[PDB]
Short mmCIF file of all heavy atoms in Angstrom, two decimals:
data_model
loop_
_atom_site.label_atom_id
_atom_site.label_comp_id
_atom_site.label_asym_id
_atom_site.label_seq_id
_atom_site.Cartn_x
_atom_site.Cartn_y
_atom_site.Cartn_z
N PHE A 9 0.77 -1.22 0.00
CA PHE A 9 0.00 0.00 0.00
C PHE A 9 0.81 1.27 0.00
O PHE A 9 0.25 2.33 0.33
CB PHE A 9 -1.00 0.00 1.15
CG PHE A 9 -2.13 -0.97 0.92
CD1 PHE A 9 -2.18 -2.17 1.61
CD2 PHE A 9 -3.16 -0.67 0.05
CE1 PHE A 9 -3.22 -3.07 1.40
CE2 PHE A 9 -4.20 -1.55 -0.15
CZ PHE A 9 -4.22 -2.75 0.53
N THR A 10 2.09 1.20 -0.33
CA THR A 10 2.89 2.41 -0.50
C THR A 10 3.03 2.66 -2.00
O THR A 10 2.69 1.79 -2.81
CB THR A 10 4.27 2.22 0.15
OG1 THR A 10 5.02 1.25 -0.60
CG2 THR A 10 4.19 1.85 1.63
N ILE A 11 3.56 3.82 -2.40
CA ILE A 11 3.92 4.05 -3.78
C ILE A 11 5.38 4.47 -3.81
O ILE A 11 5.85 5.12 -2.87
CB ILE A 11 2.97 5.01 -4.54
CG1 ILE A 11 3.17 6.45 -4.07
CG2 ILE A 11 1.51 4.55 -4.41
CD1 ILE A 11 2.52 7.49 -4.93
N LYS A 12 6.13 4.03 -4.82
CA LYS A 12 7.53 4.42 -4.93
C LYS A 12 7.50 5.67 -5.80
O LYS A 12 7.63 5.59 -7.02
CB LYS A 12 8.37 3.32 -5.60
CG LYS A 12 8.42 2.06 -4.77
CD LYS A 12 9.27 1.01 -5.50
CE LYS A 12 9.23 -0.31 -4.79
NZ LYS A 12 9.93 -1.36 -5.58
N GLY A 13 7.23 6.80 -5.17
CA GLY A 13 7.13 8.05 -5.91
C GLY A 13 8.44 8.80 -5.91
O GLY A 13 9.49 8.26 -5.52
N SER A 14 8.38 10.04 -6.35
CA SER A 14 9.51 10.95 -6.35
C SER A 14 8.88 12.21 -5.83
O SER A 14 8.17 12.92 -6.55
CB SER A 14 10.08 11.14 -7.75
OG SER A 14 11.03 12.18 -7.73
N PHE A 15 9.07 12.46 -4.55
CA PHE A 15 8.43 13.57 -3.89
C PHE A 15 9.39 14.19 -2.92
O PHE A 15 10.05 13.48 -2.16
CB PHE A 15 7.25 13.04 -3.07
CG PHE A 15 6.04 12.60 -3.85
CD1 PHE A 15 5.49 11.34 -3.65
CD2 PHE A 15 5.36 13.48 -4.66
CE1 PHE A 15 4.32 10.96 -4.30
CE2 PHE A 15 4.20 13.10 -5.31
CZ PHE A 15 3.67 11.85 -5.10
N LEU A 16 9.41 15.51 -2.87
CA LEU A 16 10.24 16.25 -1.93
C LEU A 16 9.31 16.95 -0.93
O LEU A 16 8.07 16.92 -1.07
CB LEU A 16 11.08 17.30 -2.69
CG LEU A 16 12.02 16.77 -3.76
CD1 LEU A 16 12.64 17.92 -4.55
CD2 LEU A 16 13.09 15.89 -3.18
N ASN A 17 9.88 17.64 0.07
CA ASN A 17 9.09 18.43 1.00
C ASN A 17 8.29 19.50 0.22
O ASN A 17 8.82 20.10 -0.72
CB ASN A 17 9.98 19.10 2.04
CG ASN A 17 9.19 19.63 3.20
OD1 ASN A 17 8.07 19.17 3.49
ND2 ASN A 17 9.75 20.62 3.89
N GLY A 18 7.02 19.64 0.53
CA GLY A 18 6.14 20.56 -0.19
C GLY A 18 5.27 19.88 -1.23
O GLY A 18 4.38 20.51 -1.82
N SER A 19 5.52 18.57 -1.48
CA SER A 19 4.75 17.83 -2.49
C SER A 19 3.41 17.34 -1.97
O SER A 19 2.61 16.87 -2.77
CB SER A 19 5.54 16.62 -2.97
OG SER A 19 5.78 15.80 -1.85
N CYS A 20 3.13 17.44 -0.65
CA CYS A 20 1.85 16.96 -0.13
C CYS A 20 0.68 17.62 -0.82
O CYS A 20 0.77 18.79 -1.20
CB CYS A 20 1.77 17.14 1.38
SG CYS A 20 3.08 16.27 2.27
N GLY A 21 -0.33 16.82 -1.10
CA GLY A 21 -1.47 17.32 -1.84
C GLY A 21 -1.37 17.03 -3.32
O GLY A 21 -2.35 17.17 -4.03
N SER A 22 -0.17 16.61 -3.82
CA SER A 22 -0.04 16.19 -5.23
C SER A 22 -0.94 14.96 -5.42
O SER A 22 -1.15 14.19 -4.46
CB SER A 22 1.40 15.78 -5.55
OG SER A 22 2.26 16.90 -5.47
N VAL A 23 -1.52 14.80 -6.63
CA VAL A 23 -2.46 13.71 -6.81
C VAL A 23 -2.06 12.72 -7.89
O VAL A 23 -1.26 13.02 -8.79
CB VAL A 23 -3.90 14.26 -7.04
CG1 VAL A 23 -4.39 15.10 -5.86
CG2 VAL A 23 -4.00 15.02 -8.34
N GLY A 24 -2.64 11.52 -7.76
CA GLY A 24 -2.53 10.43 -8.70
C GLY A 24 -3.87 10.25 -9.37
O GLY A 24 -4.93 10.43 -8.75
N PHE A 25 -3.83 9.86 -10.64
CA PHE A 25 -5.03 9.78 -11.44
C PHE A 25 -4.86 8.92 -12.65
O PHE A 25 -3.74 8.65 -13.08
CB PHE A 25 -5.41 11.22 -11.91
CG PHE A 25 -4.35 11.86 -12.79
CD1 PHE A 25 -4.46 11.84 -14.17
CD2 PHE A 25 -3.25 12.49 -12.24
CE1 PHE A 25 -3.48 12.39 -14.98
CE2 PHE A 25 -2.25 13.02 -13.06
CZ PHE A 25 -2.38 12.98 -14.42
N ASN A 26 -5.98 8.54 -13.25
CA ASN A 26 -6.04 7.88 -14.54
C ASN A 26 -7.03 8.69 -15.38
O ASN A 26 -7.84 9.44 -14.83
CB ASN A 26 -6.49 6.43 -14.42
CG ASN A 26 -5.41 5.54 -13.88
OD1 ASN A 26 -4.41 5.24 -14.57
ND2 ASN A 26 -5.57 5.12 -12.64
N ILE A 27 -6.88 8.66 -16.70
CA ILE A 27 -7.78 9.38 -17.60
C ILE A 27 -8.17 8.46 -18.77
O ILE A 27 -7.87 8.75 -19.94
CB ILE A 27 -7.25 10.74 -18.16
CG1 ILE A 27 -6.47 11.55 -17.13
CG2 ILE A 27 -8.42 11.55 -18.78
CD1 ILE A 27 -5.91 12.87 -17.67
N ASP A 28 -8.84 7.37 -18.46
CA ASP A 28 -9.38 6.50 -19.50
C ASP A 28 -10.65 7.25 -19.98
O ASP A 28 -11.48 7.61 -19.15
CB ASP A 28 -9.69 5.10 -18.92
CG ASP A 28 -8.52 4.54 -18.14
OD1 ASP A 28 -7.45 4.33 -18.74
OD2 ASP A 28 -8.66 4.34 -16.93
N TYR A 29 -10.69 7.60 -21.29
CA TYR A 29 -11.70 8.41 -21.99
C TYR A 29 -11.41 9.92 -21.70
O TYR A 29 -10.24 10.29 -21.72
CB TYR A 29 -13.14 7.93 -21.69
CG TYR A 29 -14.05 7.96 -22.89
CD1 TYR A 29 -13.57 7.62 -24.16
CD2 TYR A 29 -15.39 8.27 -22.77
CE1 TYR A 29 -14.41 7.62 -25.27
CE2 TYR A 29 -16.25 8.27 -23.87
CZ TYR A 29 -15.75 7.95 -25.12
OH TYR A 29 -16.58 7.95 -26.21
N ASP A 30 -12.42 10.78 -21.49
CA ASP A 30 -12.15 12.18 -21.14
C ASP A 30 -12.43 12.45 -19.64
O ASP A 30 -12.47 13.60 -19.23
CB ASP A 30 -12.97 13.15 -22.01
CG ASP A 30 -12.13 14.16 -22.77
OD1 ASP A 30 -11.00 13.80 -23.18
OD2 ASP A 30 -12.59 15.30 -22.96
N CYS A 31 -12.60 11.38 -18.82
CA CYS A 31 -12.92 11.50 -17.41
C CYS A 31 -11.70 11.24 -16.57
O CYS A 31 -11.08 10.19 -16.70
CB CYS A 31 -14.05 10.54 -17.04
SG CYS A 31 -14.54 10.59 -15.30
N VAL A 32 -11.35 12.19 -15.70
CA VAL A 32 -10.22 12.01 -14.80
C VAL A 32 -10.68 11.25 -13.57
O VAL A 32 -11.54 11.74 -12.85
CB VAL A 32 -9.59 13.35 -14.37
CG1 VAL A 32 -8.42 13.10 -13.44
CG2 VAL A 32 -9.16 14.16 -15.58
N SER A 33 -10.09 10.10 -13.29
CA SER A 33 -10.41 9.35 -12.09
C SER A 33 -9.28 9.59 -11.09
O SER A 33 -8.17 9.09 -11.27
CB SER A 33 -10.58 7.86 -12.40
OG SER A 33 -9.42 7.32 -13.01
N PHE A 34 -9.52 10.44 -10.09
CA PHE A 34 -8.52 10.74 -9.08
C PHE A 34 -8.50 9.60 -8.09
O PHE A 34 -9.54 9.26 -7.54
CB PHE A 34 -8.86 12.04 -8.34
CG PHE A 34 -8.74 13.26 -9.23
CD1 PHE A 34 -9.87 13.88 -9.74
CD2 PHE A 34 -7.50 13.79 -9.54
CE1 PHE A 34 -9.75 15.01 -10.55
CE2 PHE A 34 -7.39 14.92 -10.33
CZ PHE A 34 -8.51 15.53 -10.83
N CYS A 35 -7.33 8.99 -7.85
CA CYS A 35 -7.23 7.85 -6.96
C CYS A 35 -6.28 8.03 -5.81
O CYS A 35 -6.27 7.17 -4.93
CB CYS A 35 -6.85 6.60 -7.75
SG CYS A 35 -5.31 6.78 -8.68
N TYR A 36 -5.46 9.08 -5.81
CA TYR A 36 -4.46 9.21 -4.77
C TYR A 36 -4.18 10.66 -4.46
O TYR A 36 -4.14 11.48 -5.36
CB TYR A 36 -3.17 8.53 -5.27
CG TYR A 36 -2.00 8.63 -4.32
CD1 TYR A 36 -1.85 7.72 -3.29
CD2 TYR A 36 -1.03 9.62 -4.47
CE1 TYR A 36 -0.78 7.80 -2.41
CE2 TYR A 36 0.04 9.72 -3.59
CZ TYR A 36 0.15 8.82 -2.54
OH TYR A 36 1.20 8.90 -1.66
N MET A 37 -3.97 10.96 -3.19
CA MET A 37 -3.52 12.28 -2.76
C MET A 37 -2.33 12.01 -1.86
O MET A 37 -2.43 11.19 -0.95
CB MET A 37 -4.58 13.10 -2.02
CG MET A 37 -3.97 14.39 -1.51
SD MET A 37 -5.21 15.55 -0.96
CE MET A 37 -5.62 16.32 -2.51
N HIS A 38 -1.22 12.69 -2.12
CA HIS A 38 0.01 12.43 -1.38
C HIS A 38 0.01 13.06 -0.01
O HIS A 38 -0.26 14.25 0.11
CB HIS A 38 1.21 12.92 -2.20
CG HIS A 38 2.51 12.60 -1.54
ND1 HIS A 38 2.78 11.33 -1.10
CD2 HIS A 38 3.55 13.41 -1.23
CE1 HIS A 38 3.98 11.39 -0.55
NE2 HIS A 38 4.49 12.62 -0.61
N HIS A 39 0.34 12.27 1.02
CA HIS A 39 0.42 12.81 2.37
C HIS A 39 1.81 12.76 2.98
O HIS A 39 2.17 13.70 3.70
CB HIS A 39 -0.52 12.06 3.33
CG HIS A 39 -1.94 12.44 3.22
ND1 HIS A 39 -2.66 12.19 2.07
CD2 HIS A 39 -2.75 13.01 4.14
CE1 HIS A 39 -3.88 12.65 2.32
NE2 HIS A 39 -3.98 13.12 3.56
N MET A 40 2.54 11.64 2.81
CA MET A 40 3.80 11.51 3.54
C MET A 40 4.82 10.58 2.96
O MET A 40 4.51 9.72 2.13
CB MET A 40 3.54 11.12 4.99
CG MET A 40 2.89 9.80 5.17
SD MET A 40 2.69 9.39 6.95
CE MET A 40 2.30 7.67 6.80
N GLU A 41 6.05 10.75 3.44
CA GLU A 41 7.13 9.88 3.03
C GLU A 41 7.54 9.06 4.25
O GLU A 41 7.81 9.62 5.30
CB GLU A 41 8.32 10.69 2.54
CG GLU A 41 9.44 9.78 2.08
CD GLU A 41 10.54 10.52 1.37
OE1 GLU A 41 10.28 11.07 0.28
OE2 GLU A 41 11.67 10.56 1.91
N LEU A 42 7.61 7.74 4.09
CA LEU A 42 8.02 6.81 5.13
C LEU A 42 9.55 6.78 5.22
O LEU A 42 10.23 7.23 4.30
CB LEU A 42 7.43 5.42 4.83
CG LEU A 42 5.93 5.35 5.02
CD1 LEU A 42 5.35 4.16 4.29
CD2 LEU A 42 5.57 5.29 6.48
N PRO A 43 10.13 6.27 6.34
CA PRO A 43 11.59 6.27 6.49
C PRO A 43 12.38 5.58 5.38
O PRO A 43 13.52 5.97 5.13
CB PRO A 43 11.81 5.60 7.85
CG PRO A 43 10.54 5.88 8.60
CD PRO A 43 9.47 5.76 7.56
N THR A 44 11.80 4.59 4.69
CA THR A 44 12.50 3.93 3.58
C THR A 44 12.47 4.74 2.27
O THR A 44 12.97 4.25 1.26
CB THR A 44 11.98 2.52 3.34
OG1 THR A 44 10.57 2.58 3.16
CG2 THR A 44 12.36 1.55 4.47
N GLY A 45 11.88 5.94 2.28
CA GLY A 45 11.83 6.77 1.09
C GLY A 45 10.65 6.50 0.18
O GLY A 45 10.60 7.05 -0.93
N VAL A 46 9.73 5.61 0.59
CA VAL A 46 8.52 5.33 -0.18
C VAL A 46 7.38 6.21 0.37
O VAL A 46 7.55 6.88 1.39
CB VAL A 46 8.17 3.84 -0.21
CG1 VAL A 46 9.31 3.03 -0.83
CG2 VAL A 46 7.81 3.34 1.19
N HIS A 47 6.23 6.22 -0.31
CA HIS A 47 5.20 7.20 -0.04
C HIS A 47 3.86 6.64 0.33
O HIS A 47 3.46 5.58 -0.14
CB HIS A 47 5.11 8.13 -1.27
CG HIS A 47 6.44 8.78 -1.54
ND1 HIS A 47 7.25 8.34 -2.57
CD2 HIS A 47 7.12 9.69 -0.81
CE1 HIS A 47 8.37 9.04 -2.47
NE2 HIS A 47 8.32 9.88 -1.43
N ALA A 48 3.15 7.39 1.19
CA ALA A 48 1.84 6.99 1.65
C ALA A 48 0.87 8.15 1.45
O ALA A 48 1.22 9.33 1.56
CB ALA A 48 1.89 6.57 3.12
N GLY A 49 -0.35 7.80 1.10
CA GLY A 49 -1.39 8.78 0.90
C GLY A 49 -2.76 8.18 1.00
O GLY A 49 -2.92 7.04 1.42
N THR A 50 -3.75 8.95 0.55
CA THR A 50 -5.13 8.55 0.70
C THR A 50 -5.83 8.53 -0.64
O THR A 50 -5.32 9.08 -1.61
CB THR A 50 -5.83 9.61 1.61
OG1 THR A 50 -5.91 10.87 0.92
CG2 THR A 50 -5.16 9.78 2.95
#
């Protein structure tokens, strides 16, 4: 349930999404970086 993102301080609130057709499906909002450098969000 983590994502191996590329995020620095200030990146919180960045989002993940898919755009199959013309509809944006928002699936992730970035909240934090864990000690191993991977990412957690909602």
Side-chain angles (χ1 to χ4, degrees):
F9 289 105
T10 68
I11 72 167
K12 296 180 186 173
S14 171
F15 287 127
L16 301 172
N17 194 24
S19 60
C20 302
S22 294
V23 300
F25 62 98
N26 285 288
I27 321 178
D28 310 298
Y29 220 37
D30 237 34
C31 180
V32 180
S33 57
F34 292 104
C35 57
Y36 178 85
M37 175 167 275
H38 184 50
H39 282 65
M40 63 177 194
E41 182 170 295
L42 290 161
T44 54
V46 301
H47 303 103
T50 68

